[PDB]
Amino acid sequence: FGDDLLGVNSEIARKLRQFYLEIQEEALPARLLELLERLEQAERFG
């Protein structure tokens, strides 16, 4: 299965998904959420 570049049964394909997941386990910074709220608020007054 040479056309399978990522390797559906490879350990590296799994580790890539794991790394991506573990990063998202961490809390999304409040200032980022607060910024999003403030952007929406500014649109509202328009």
Binding site: R17, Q18, E22, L35
Partner: protein, 160 residues
């Protein structure tokens, strides 16, 4: 409309993970996401209906990131002369993967290989969409993915 905001909240965690994976400095990744959010909000009306929003957002972050690297590279060239590369990731909260080691392995890759393997192997983009993000051909992404994958296997000492 609340709709664009709610769409962002869905993509925001993956967007942050992309920035951290891409960054060469641990304490600069979080500002990169912030700047991306501000630019995306301003350009939200230029988002083509029916297209990939995640790819649209990742493109903005990617381009802003390389823009920062070019600017920082000029300031380094006109000052001390040393680029600082730093890795600082809290240990895995859910599983057992050594995140610090994996990130260090990612940094051993070229800039093109690192981004390609993240977009394809982690971000869930198709070869077509990843090519559009990087502004290259599909064949280029595929070769970059293959080289990055083989290097990571040797780096992380995994036979698969």
């Amino acid at each position: 409309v609340k709709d664009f905001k709610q769409e962002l909240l869905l993509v925001l965690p993956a967007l942050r993970a992309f920035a951290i994976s891409l960054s060469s400095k641990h304490d600069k990744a979080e500002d990169l996401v912030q700047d991306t959010l501000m630019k995306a909000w301003a350009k939200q009306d230029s988002f083509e209906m029916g297209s990939n929003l995640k790819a649209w957002l990742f493109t903005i972050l990617r381009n802003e990131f390389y823009s920062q690297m070019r600017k920082r590279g000029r300031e380094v060239q006109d000052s001390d002369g040393v680029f600082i590369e730093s890795v600082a990731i809290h240990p895995a909260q859910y599983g057992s993967l050594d995140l610090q080691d994996f990130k260090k392995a990612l940094n051993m890759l070229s800039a093109d290989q690192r981004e390609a393997i993240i977009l394809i192997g982690a971000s869930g983009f198709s070869y077509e969409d990843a090519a559009a993000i990087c502004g290259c051909a599909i064949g280029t992404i595929k070769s970059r993915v293959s080289r990055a994958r083989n290097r990571l296997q040797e780096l992380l000492k995994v036979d698969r």
